[PDB]
Nucleic acid binder design. Structure first.
Lengths: 402, 1140
DNA sequence: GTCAGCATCGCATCATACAGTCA
DNA sequence: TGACTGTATGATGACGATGCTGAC
């Protein structure tokens, strides 16, 4: 009903539609009436142009969010021609972590489960820089850049060392230090604004540091593994850890510590993989371990706006699937692990990359190509938002248009 | 690196906010208008509007309401800005001093949260005990309004209805009650809550939930004798209280959505409505009483008043006068009759206020003033679509121009008081004089008894006690009236010549040789008093008595040759008082001492046209604040006389000037005339408040234009203009334009109103072309209202529409260039277009069509179709460079008159903005930021030199120089990119670095290089390099110019001190206000100097300048300047002001 | 032979069970 | 002697590459 009458307008000009499905379609209506079949030529002619909404913006009449929403349908359209895969570059011992280069649009970094990292940049045909690990307990978990000089990167390995190391191989000191063996970490995130680092491990306790020393943190953030942590870009000051518990718990770090003390903490069914703070810093993309994807708001962190069911299971030897926001847009990207048991629209439900609107929850696009049936559990758009890099098993996939 | 300078030239004319009440006093009614960053205030008068204070802010005014707390003497103004700075302001006047005082301020917000689409809305409630704010979806901010908190602490509370259209506080309720309209899957509904600050939360409202309409957009809280709220949607307006409800659906509404309301009578009997199509609506509520008296309602009435400008804001005043605030056109004072006119319509326009925005395109063109012109043309958009011509200085026109060689001086007079004015003009040739009587426009000579022909005078004109004075070069003469004779006539002992003069109504001096001799006037005779010697030859003279007439002067102004000094003298005791020696060997010419608004001034204006100015005190006659400025080269003469409600002082030269005062500082506004010599004030009864020019070749005479700093001419189109350019060889403009059309049901469209285009003298119409739309086009008539795009040829002088070309059905005109190409001598009009269909969101087909203009027919040549929308195009080395969707294609113009595609650049998402310098190309992309291409004279292809890696949604783009690139962004921010000058690797030289950032507070639509300022003529070198102008959506015009590293660092520390004393208004820190701020990030400025802050130094008091300079030694360098900078920096800030 | 169809191997969670402390 | 929390062990679901056969 209202979501199909709340889409192609988008809004200004307010004129056209307004009839509210013809002042109510006598409840649907019952039996035949449209339905979503002829929700087709309506959406086909949606907004009228852009070149006339742009002009409406150029006159200051149309509000910016109106535009940006009709500008992201200019996106999606090109994303429907992303369907081709410029490059792919592999290596043994499977892909686990993924990070883009903050500044550069052509370089990306990938981690292994064996301890081996690759700095891959393109438009160069020069060969990627590499680091060789231990190939056993060398699993990398959460790999991020160094916000100062890009030629350095932070990392969190199963070997037990959250380090700062150059791509030229040489370790530039170490942040965290286990001293035992039976423990290692699963998460890591930093920040340029508030100057911190963070790491969550598999026992539920987490550490936080400055980019210089500082071990003001170790307190248990819960029972069992911390699968993911993420700092708020616009808040800085704010933090959120998602993990196996069936709870995301948030925090603001700072004030409040004394154990069982944390602003919010929202529960779930099943384990969770991702927190993922938004570019704006307000929404959180929690992404569960069975189906269901949730989104809370900054208004009531307790209550979620709505759940998006979506088949992405857990598996011992399948890299955990984390969904992620798009920069620039309110889009959501996630790989698909099709599943024999649910409510599904479209047989035969292949494996693919899914994209929804964060304000709706509806699927706007899907990305798939044969010659590559692998499950992509990592995708995470580049900071310009013009390309997508999926980590898929032994492979690394570069989504562009060209 | 990059050091830049931004200054506001023409302030925004577009009216954002409007509100009425009693802000300055109780006895007076106030009009408050908001123009983006400007708050302007007015007092309503008898058939007029009186302006009293103009204060700017460090913000975009989002909320503006008048409200008076209980017990409070007065009326406070709550202002909320776009960056969420909140302030409560109060008006205070202490004699001459008027300042706006802030009772309470604070930047409330949520540290994180997404700003809702419809914008923020603020409501202050009738009882004035809280301020409600809707900043973010799902939360309701409420500000406890007691003076405490002076910091405006607020608390948010959960709003579970996530989607609110409009909200209002209610009147006459037992408790604070909110009334909003929200939307859920079941449609939109009206709902009430009680806002209790106890518990800091809501409580159950007096109402159950309803099911209003399906498109209700505006809520109005109706006061008593009632309560409850009327809800106006489109198609239907309804009333809602507790038990009762009222609903009407007049069919005169569905045509246009009504967008604004305003209470006429405070009781809430009747309201004014306005729509997007400028139609004005009355809304009447008729009340009811049972028995002796009760209260109720009996339907509504709408009666339909008439048509005004497009109301963004509406407000009623008194006596049927409504002020209409328009963003898309001029704001109006309008008068409401009880009797329709010929057209119907109770609406009649009182006054119109010029509104420049939205400026969708502007172009600097050098018409008229041949050498430089100065003019800036721009656009208005919609029914208020127009061209505005903007130029610096003031102009006059010559009604009668009789040729006349070799004059010197000229004078007015009228013998007869019974008419009461001045006639019979006189002018003097070399050695002789000539008298010319006034009647109509004819002058000639004729003959007047007693007027002396054989001799030339320096004085004439009527003089008190019914008489004329005429003092010649051989003697001094006096004239009688009724008999017209020569009672009294005076000579000097040795029959010498008269050299240096002066004179005045009640007294005169005549000098001769040296000294001053000093004369004095008695009834019909002389009787001189005392004598003079002084020091050698004296350079001219002025007696002018400072005051009403007066006409007796206690004062005498004079000059010298050797010492070169304008002295002032006591009378009749003379005696030197103030020395002041001046450097140079030039000599002082044309002195004077003026009076304007209590102020006490004088002027002295030497051989260079250079001129000095003082601020004075008459009591001691002592001069101070020593400063001079220089203009041109040619001699200046100095008269001085009146006109309406100002005063004037003006010098005469190659660049004829004028000096006044504005808000108690001076102003120098030039005139547009070529050459002036002698000229004289002539206020005739067939020429009310006019003036006569004498020139070297002819006379002049005319009426003089409106009194401003910037002159603006307006030619309404009555339809939206989009792009403009100049065709010098055709002496006319090309204007892409469009009108809305609507279906005629009988094929065709039958139009809507007579406007531009449809009134062209010749016109032409597009001709298909293929598409291909053939084989059953199969669209519809659905999606009514149609836009017809046009090209208009407009004369540069008469501004009459010469030619109108209509484009294809469903075509959008996007770009336009005037240029010639190849070895082809013809200058063309090239327009790039786009086809825009219902069925398609992205255009896939457009056209690059070439026109050539000859004798009003406008023939077509090229006509070339492309696959995509041509967004931008620009002349490029005899070639045409164009942007088609995601492609940057360079066309070549060949001898068979066809367009040929040389090379391509395919790597873009969508390229909208193209700018070029030399072989370099600056590409602006709505998505993937900025891109710098160059060109290859013998490869043809497109290398990609560098790119900015940081994503920016751009509105306009420009090239400052070879290595710096200016951009405007969607959040009202400015940024600059640079190619890395350091060779080193390839990596760094492929990365443009963002070195400049600055929050403009405005949305820039177009950049253009140029200036409205003359050259020099001292003291070239110039202090700043380059000059980039820009047009904005709110009608503001700004300037960007390059700076040296001395200055940027100079003015940067200078800003910081100024940022200590201002005084702020609202207490907003200038750094915060200028910090780069978008939805994702907040970062300081850097790379950008706010010129507005720097020139706003000239207005503080003298102990304040002294408060900064005395330590501005804390930094100032050595060489020949320290604290002497204290009058350097005024001479540096003078040096700023003149770049625009 | 390139391609179809089975073994085989590469520390994730939910569920059992004993110690280890901590206090 | 309750609690909380940390130790070598097991069922298990079902992706990847790697690899070996037999049977076309």
């Amino acid at each position: 009903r209202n979501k199909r009458s709340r889409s192609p307008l988008e809004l200004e000009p307010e004129a056209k539609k307004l009839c509210a499905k013809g002042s109510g379609p006598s409840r649907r209506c019952d039996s035949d009436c449209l339905w979503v079949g002829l929700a087709g030529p309506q959406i086909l002619p949606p907004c009228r142009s852009i070149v006339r909404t742009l002009h409406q913006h150029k006159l200051g009449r149309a509000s910016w969010p109106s535009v940006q929403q009709g500008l992201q349908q200019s996106f999606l359209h090109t994303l429907d021609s992303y369907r081709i895969l410029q490059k792919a570059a592999p290596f043994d011992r499977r892909a686990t972590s993924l990070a883009w280069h903050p500044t550069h649009p052509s370089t990306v970094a990938v981690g292994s489960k064996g301890g081996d990292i690759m700095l891959w940049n393109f438009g160069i045909k020069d060969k990627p820089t590499f680091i060789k690990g231990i190939g056993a307990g060398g699993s990398i978990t959460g790999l991020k850049f160094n916000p100062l000089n890009t030629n350095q990167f932070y990392a969190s390995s199963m070997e037990g060392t959250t380090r700062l190391q150059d791509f030229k191989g040489n370790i530039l000191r170490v942040f965290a230090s286990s001293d035992t063996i039976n423990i290692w970490f699963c998460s890591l995130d930093v920040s340029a604004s508030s100057r911190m680092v963070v790491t969550g491990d598999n026992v539920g306790n987490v550490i936080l540091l400055n980019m210089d020393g500082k071990e003001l943190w170790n307190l248990r953030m819960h029972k069992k593994k911390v699968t993911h942590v993420a700092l708020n870009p616009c808040c800085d000051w704010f933090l959120a850890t998602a993990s196996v518990d069936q709870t995301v718990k948030i925090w603001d770090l700072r004030q409040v510590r004394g154990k069982a003390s944390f602003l919010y903490s929202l529960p779930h069914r099943h384990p969770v993989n991702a927190a993922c703070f938004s570019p704006d810093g307000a929404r959180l993309l929690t992404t569960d371990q069975k189906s269901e994807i949730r989104v809370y708001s900054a208004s009531q962190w307790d209550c979620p706006l709505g759940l998006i069911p979506h088949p992405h299971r857990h598996f011992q030897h399948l890299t955990p699937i984390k969904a992620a926001w798009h920069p620039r847009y309110n889009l959501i990207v996630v790989g698909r692990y099709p599943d024999p048991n649910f409510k599904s629209c479209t047989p035969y439900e292949l494996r693919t990359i899914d994209v929804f609107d964060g304000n709706s929850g509806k699927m706007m696009c899907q990305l798939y190509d044969p010659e590559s049936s692998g499950i992509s559990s990592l995708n995470e758009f580049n900071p310009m938002g013009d390309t997508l890099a999926s980590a898929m098993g032994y492979h690394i996939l570069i989504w562009s248009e060209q | 690196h990059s050091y830049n300078y931004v200054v506001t030239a023409q302030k925004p004319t577009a009216v954002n906010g409007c509100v009425t009440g009693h802000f300055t006093s109780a006895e007076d009614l106030n009009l408050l208008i908001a123009k983006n960053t400007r708050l302007e205030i007015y007092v309503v008068t008898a058939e007029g509007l009186r302006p009293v204070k103009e204060v700017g802010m460090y913000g975009k005014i989002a909320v503006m309401e008048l409200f008076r707390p209980k017990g409070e003497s007065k009326d406070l103004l709550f202002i909320l800005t776009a960056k969420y700075n909140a302030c409560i302001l109060e008006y205070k006047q202490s004699g001459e001093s008027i300042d706006i005082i802030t009772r309470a301020h604070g930047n409330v917000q949520d540290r994180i949260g997404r700003p809702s689409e419809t914008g923020i809305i603020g409501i202050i409630d009738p009882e004035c005990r809280m301020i409600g704010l809707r900043l973010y979806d799902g939360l309701f901010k409420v500000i406890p309004l007691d003076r405490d908190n002076k910091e405006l602490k607020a608390f948010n509370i959960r709003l579970e209805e996530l989607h609110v259209i409009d909200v209002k506080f209610l009147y006459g309720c037992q408790a604070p009650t909110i009334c909003f309209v929200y939307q859920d899957p079941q449609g939109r509904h009206v709902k009430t809550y009680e806002v209790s600050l106890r518990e800091k939360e809501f409580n159950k409202g007096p109402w159950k939930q309803e099911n209003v309409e399906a498109e209700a957009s505006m809520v109005i809280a109706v006061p008593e004798p009632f309560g409850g709220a009327i809800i106006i949607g489109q198609e239907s307006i309804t009333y809602h209280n507790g038990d009762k409800y009222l609903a009407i659906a007049p069919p005169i509404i569905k045509q246009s959505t009504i967008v604004c309301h305003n209470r006429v009578d405070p009781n809430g009997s009747r309201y004014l409505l306005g729509d997007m199509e400028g139609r004005l609506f009355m809304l009447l509520l008729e009340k009811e009483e049972q028995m002796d008296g009760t209260v109720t309602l009996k339907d509504l009435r709408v009666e339909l008043l008439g048509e005004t400008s497009i109301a963004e804001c509406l407000t009623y005043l008194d006596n049927g006068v409504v002020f209409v605030g328009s963003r898309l056109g001029d704001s109006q004072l309008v008068k409401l009759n009880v009797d329709s006119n010929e057209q119907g319509s109770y609406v009649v326009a009182m006054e119109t206020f010029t509104n420049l925005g939205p400026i969708v395109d502007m172009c600097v063109v050098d018409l008229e003033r041949q050498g430089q012109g100065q003019l800036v043309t721009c656009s208005g958009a919609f029914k208020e679509g127009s061209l505005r011509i903007i130029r610096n200085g003031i102009g006059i026109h010559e009604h009668a121009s009789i040729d006349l060689p070799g004059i010197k001086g000229l004078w007015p007079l009228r013998s007869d008081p019974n008419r009461e004015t001045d006639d019979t003009l006189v002018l003097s040739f070399v050695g002789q004089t000539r008298v010319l009587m006034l009647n109509g426009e004819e002058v000639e000579e004729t003959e007047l008894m007693g007027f002396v022909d054989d001799q030339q005078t320096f004085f004439c004109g009527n003089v008190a006690h019914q008489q004329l004075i005429q003092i010649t070069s051989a003697s001094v003469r006096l004239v009688s009236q009724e008999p017209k004779a020569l009672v009294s006539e005076w000579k000097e002992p040795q029959a010498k010549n008269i050299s240096v003069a002066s004179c005045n109504s009640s007294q005169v001096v005549v000098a001769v040789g040296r000294a001053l001799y000093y004369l004095q006037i008695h009834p019909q005779e002389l009787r001189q008093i005392s004598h003079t010697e002084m020091e050698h030859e004296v350079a001219c003279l002025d007696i002018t008595p400072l005051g009403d007439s007066n006409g007796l002067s206690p004062l005498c102004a004079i000059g010298l040759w050797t010492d070169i000094s304008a002295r002032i003298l006591k009378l009749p005791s003379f005696e030197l008082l103030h020395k002041e020696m001046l450097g140079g060997e030039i000599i002082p010419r044309s002195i004077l001492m003026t009076t304007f608004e209590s102020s006490h001034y004088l002027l002295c204006a030497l051989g260079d046209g250079a001129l000095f100015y003082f601020g004075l005190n008459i009591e001691t006659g002592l001069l101070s604040d020593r400063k001079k400025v220089t203009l041109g080269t040619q001699p200046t003469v100095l008269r001085t006389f009146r006109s309406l409600s100002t005063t004037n002082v003006f010098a005469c030269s190659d660049r004829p000037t004028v000096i006044y005062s504005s808000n108690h500082k001076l102003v120098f506004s030039n005139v547009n005339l070529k050459e002036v010599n002698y000229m004289c004030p002539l206020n005739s009864d067939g020429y009310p408040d006019s003036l006569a020019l004498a020139n070297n070749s002819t006379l002049t005479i005319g009426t003089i234009d409106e009194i401003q700093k910037l002159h603006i001419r307006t030619v309404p189109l009555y339809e939206s203009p989009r792009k403009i350019c100049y065709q010098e060889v055709s002496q006319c403009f090309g204007v892409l334009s469009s009108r809305i059309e609507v279906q005629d049901t009988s094929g065709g469209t039958t139009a809507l109103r007579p406007s531009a285009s449809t009134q062209a003298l010749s016109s032409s119409v597009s001709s298909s072309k293929l598409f291909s739309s053939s084989t059953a086009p199969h669209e519809t008539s659905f999606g009514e209202e149609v836009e017809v795009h046009n090209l208009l040829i407009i004369d540069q002088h008469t501004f009459e529409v010469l030619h109108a070309h209509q484009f294809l059905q469903n075509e959008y005109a996007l770009s336009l260039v005037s240029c010639k190409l190849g070895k082809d001598p013809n200058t063309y009009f090239i327009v790039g277009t786009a086809m825009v269909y219902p069925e398609e969101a992205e255009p896939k087909q457009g056209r690059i069509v070439v026109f050539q203009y000859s004798d009003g027919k406008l023939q077509t040549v090229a006509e070339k179709e492309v696959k995509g929308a041509v967004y931008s195009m620009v002349e490029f080395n005899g070639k045409l460079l164009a942007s088609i969707n995601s492609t940057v294609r360079l066309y070549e113009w060949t001898t068979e008159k066809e367009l040929r595609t040389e090379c391509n650049h395919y790597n873009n998402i969508m390229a909208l903005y193209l700018k070029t310098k030399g072989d370099f190309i600056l590409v602006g992309d709505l998505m993937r930021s900025v891109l710098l291409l160059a060109y290859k004279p013998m490869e043809g292809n497109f290398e990609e030199i560098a790119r900015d890696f940081n994503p920016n949604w751009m509105s306009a783009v420009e090239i400052l120089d070879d290595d710096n690139f200016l951009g405007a962004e969607n959040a009202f921010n400015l940024f600059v990119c640079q190619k890395d000058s350091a060779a080193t690797t390839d990596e760094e030289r492929q990365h443009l670095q963002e070195v400049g950032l600055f929050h403009l507070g405005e949305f820039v639509n177009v950049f253009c290089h140029g200036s409205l300022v003359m050259q020099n003529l001292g003291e070239t070198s110039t202090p700043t390099q380059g000059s980039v102008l820009f047009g904005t959506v709110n009608g503001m015009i700004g300037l960007v110019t390059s700076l040296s590293e001395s200055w940027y660092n100079l003015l940067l520390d200078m800003q910081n001190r100024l940022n200590k004393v201002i005084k702020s208004v609202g207490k907003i820190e200038h750094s915060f206000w200028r910090s780069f701020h978008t939805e994702r990030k907040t970062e300081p400025a850097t790379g950008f100097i706010d010129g507005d802050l720097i020139e706003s130094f000239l207005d503080i008091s003298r102990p304040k300048m002294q408060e900064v300079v005395a330590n501005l030694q804390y930094d100032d360098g050595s060489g020949m300047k320290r604290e002497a900078t204290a009058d350097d920096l005024i001479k540096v800030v003078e040096e700023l002001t003149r770049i625009h």
